[PDB]
């Protein structure tokens, strides 16, 4: 069944991802093109079919929990792969949302961060490590108030052993990566979630340079509650083993009394 018949292709979105529509029911989709010559990590499916790791990772997390953008279909071509993904509309990415709104109210940030935590727990439970958690890789469904993770292209199978490669965003990467070119998955994820939470409540990331990342100093440029400052500093512990678990984050006093997604939409997005 050809790709060119099953889907109607619209204009670009970024990069190489196009707006599109599935003919069999006019579903909004996103159509992502990846050049074979640019892929580093290759997985195998049950079929044995050699595919990009991104396809392997997306299939493991696309089980129906809505906190991740689901892969609906994919196709191989001579020099490229084509991924069919879901497209919420209306949608805005968290980077653009924070750029326009500035620093978020703790209540909104609490809802957003909670949903990211549930989505990352989902990936971990499915054996997938994202490795590029940042505002740019989070979509907001503005009507539903639901956050969705995108871009598993820097991703990996979750292991308990050390990682020595990283193609994610340097300013969200942990001090142990900067210093020693080594990290563990969970502990690095919690560091990047510390950067993301700072980003939400202060209106930008805390660190631009290697020195700041390894420095172990977090200055708040914005009024932030003591409980929120405490959680951020805990996620941004220099020693990986000093960082909280996903459990400890979600049991943290700052994380209590979270809004439902619809409540979040009604109060803050509509």
């Amino acid at each position: 069944e050809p790709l060119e018949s099953q889907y109607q292709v619209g204009p670009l979105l970024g990069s190489s991802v196009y707006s599109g529509i599935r003919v069999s029911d006019n579903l909004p989709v996103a159509i992502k093109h990846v050049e074979k010559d640019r892929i580093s990590d290759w997985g195998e499916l049950p079929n044995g079919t050699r595919v990009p790791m991104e396809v392997v990772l997306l299939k493991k997390v696309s089980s129906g929990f809505s906190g991740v953008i689901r892969l609906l279909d994919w196709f191989e071509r001579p020099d490229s792969f084509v991924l069919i993904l879901e497209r919420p509309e209306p949608v805005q990415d968290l980077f653009d949302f924070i750029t326009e709104r500035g620093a978020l109210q703790e209540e909104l940030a609490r809802s957003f961060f909670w949903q990211v935590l549930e989505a990352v727990r989902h990936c971990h439970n499915c054996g997938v490590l994202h490795r590029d958690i940042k505002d740019e890789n989070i979509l907001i469904d503005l009507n539903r108030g639901e956050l969705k993770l995108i871009d598993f292209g820097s991703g990996a199978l979750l292991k308990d052993t050390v990682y020595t490669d990283f193609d994610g965003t340097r300013v969200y990467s942990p001090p142990e990566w900067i210093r020693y070119h080594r990290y563990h998955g969970r502990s690095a994820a919690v560091w990047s979630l510390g950067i993301l939470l700072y980003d939400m409540v202060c209106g930008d990331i805390p660190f631009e340079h290697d020195e700041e990342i390894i420095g172990g100093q977090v200055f708040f440029r914005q009024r932030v509650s003591s409980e929120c400052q405490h959680l951020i500093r805990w996620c941004l512990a220099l020693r990986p083993s000093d960082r909280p678990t996903f459990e400890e984050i979600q049991n943290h006093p700052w994380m209590q009394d979270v809004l439902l997604p619809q409540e979040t939409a009604e109060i803050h997005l509509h």
Partner: peptide, 8 residues
């Protein structure tokens, strides 16, 4: 103090 996207 320019807020900007960062490549991966």
């Amino acid at each position: 103090r320019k807020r900007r996207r960062h490549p991966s």
